Amino acid sequence: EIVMTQSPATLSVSPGERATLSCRASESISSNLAWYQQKPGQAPRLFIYTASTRATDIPARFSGSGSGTEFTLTISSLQSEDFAVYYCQQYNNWPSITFGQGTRLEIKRTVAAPSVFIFPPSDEQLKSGTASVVCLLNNFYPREAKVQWKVDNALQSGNSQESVTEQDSKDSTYSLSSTLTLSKADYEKHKVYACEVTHQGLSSPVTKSFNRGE
Amino acid sequence: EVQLVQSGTEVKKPGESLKISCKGSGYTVTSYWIGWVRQMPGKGLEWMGFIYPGDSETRYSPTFQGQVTISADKSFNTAFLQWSSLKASDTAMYYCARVGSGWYPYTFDIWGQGTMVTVSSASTKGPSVFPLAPSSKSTSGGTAALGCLVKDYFPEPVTVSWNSGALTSGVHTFPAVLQSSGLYSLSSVVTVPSSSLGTQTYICNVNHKPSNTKVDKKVEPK
């Protein structure tokens, strides 16, 4: 099957500016290339077909070009509704079709360092035999961040999970939670609980911590 | 109106069979191919196969050939996707889509809304709700964070509001994570003025309809 490779994986562009997304085919496909937009929770929708032709409702700021093995989708002035994932699809010899792996187009804004908060496990939870410790990174940009948990100065690995929000529609920031899960027995045998946050907006990493029982 | 309407959300156990459907309306269903597309959680689109409902001719992707059955009942203007024995790895959103003919040839010109399929050994379970209490070190005249941890439920979803819907600004309810136990967990947080901690009540309202579990948690400083 013909392999479709999109780049970049994530494109960050400011509203009102131009975005150019790329898609490469492993074999020539002439102009037999479509592009779809997909927003979170929603079905994909056809935007461009035969490499350069817009579907009927599609605004003129969207265009496509290319033939053979290299193709682009350009959005000449970005509107808020345009930030989404875009997939390319080849159909050189239908029914043999394949999709690219997608490019996420997100909103570029000024860097915002996270506000960081740590939460100890509740006494009620501890009755259950498990302790959850939560670290919140609030309203930051860009999305990339590193969170490290330390318990009595030992770096924890393998016992945490993260969740991140979609980009906020008003301020274009993200928030992220990291949850450390430990047994009650382990929680009660250690004292200092810390989450260290590294982000390009912070000159040095920020650590928030608590001492169990204080 | 030209549309494809898919069947509802499914939650199944490994080894169970499953048939989901895609009904066309507003056009001549027997004149166009339908395709099925899989989208695993956090992943891209994968083509599974095509069927021509007018005669049930099928063209499967090599990846899915022999793994799923695509069928059609033209008397019902409906295409189907079927598994005889589900695996947890079949957890995904499934889309059906019409293949263009004449207009937009060979593209997917009309999409169904998707059918979410979750396959897990887990059983329905309501969450436990715990406070994420505002820190005693919260900056005076500044901003404090507080929240609720909604732990150990299945299947999705849970809904969370704050103060019965009266508090919305500053709220972040995170996407759920699937834990290694097979149960989901999420937190909902909000930032508020530190000066409000003594005077304003903060209650998260949690509902897990699948288990009919409804909880209100008051969150306050220790």
Alpha helices (runs of H) in chain A, residue ranges in sequence order: 123-126, 184-188
Instruction: Name every residue in A having a CB less than 8 A away from some CB of B.
Output: 1, 32, 34, 36, 38, 43-46, 49, 55, 87, 89, 91, 94-95, 97-102, 115, 117-122, 124-125, 128, 132, 134, 136, 138, 161-165, 175, 177, 179, 181
Q: Domain-by-domain residue ranges, chain B?
A: 1-121, 122-222
Query: How many CB atoms within 10 Å of residue A127?
Result: 9
- Whether A44 sits inside 8 A of B111 (CB atoms) is yes
Q: Could you tell me the maximum CA-CA distance found in chain A, to the nearest angstrom?
A: 68
Identify the domain boundary among A109, A138, A164: A109
Segments of A58-142 assigned E as strands = 62-67, 70-75, 84-93, 96-99, 103-107, 115-119, 130-140
Q: Which of B59, B135, B151 sits opposite A132 (nearest CB)?
A: B151
HEC-encoded secondary structure of B140-164: CCCEEEEEEEEEEEECCCCEEEEHH
Phi, then psi, of B52 in degrees rounded to 5: -100, 100
Amino acid identity, position A136? L
Q: Scanning every residue of chain A, which has its alpha carbon at the shortest distance from the alpha carbon of B59?
A: A95
Resolution, expressed in angstroms to one decimal: 1.5
Residue with tokens 């360092």: A113
Amino acid identity, position B3? Q
Could you say which of 3.40.50.720, 2.60.40.10, 3.60.15.10, 2.60.40.740 is the CATH number of the domain covering B1-121? 2.60.40.10
The CATH number of whichever domain residue A168 belongs to comes to: 2.60.40.10
Contact B131, B217 (CB under 8 A): yes
Amino acid identity, position A186? D
Beta bridge partners of B215: B206
**Dihedral sign of CA atoms B105, B110, B116, B119 in order:** negative
A12 exposed, middle or buried (CB, 10 Å; 0-12, 13-18, 19+)?
middle
Beta bridge partners of A194: A150, A209
What is the residue range of A21's domain?
Answer: 1-109
Contact B135, B126 (CB under 8 A): no
Could you say which of 3.40.190.10, 3.40.50.880, 2.60.40.10, 2.60.120.10 is the CATH number of the domain covering B122-222? 2.60.40.10
Method: X-ray
User: Domain check: are A203 and A154 in the same one?
Assistant: yes
Identify the domain boundary among A91, A109, A127: A109
Beta bridge partners of A56: none
B218 and chain A in contact, CB less than 8 A: no
Residues in chain B within 8 Å Cβ distance of A46: 104, 107-109
Alpha helices (runs of H) in A58-178, residue ranges in sequence order: 123-126
CA B110 to each of CA A129, A164, B3, B49, B92: distance values in angstroms, whole numbers, following the listed order = 51, 31, 7, 16, 20
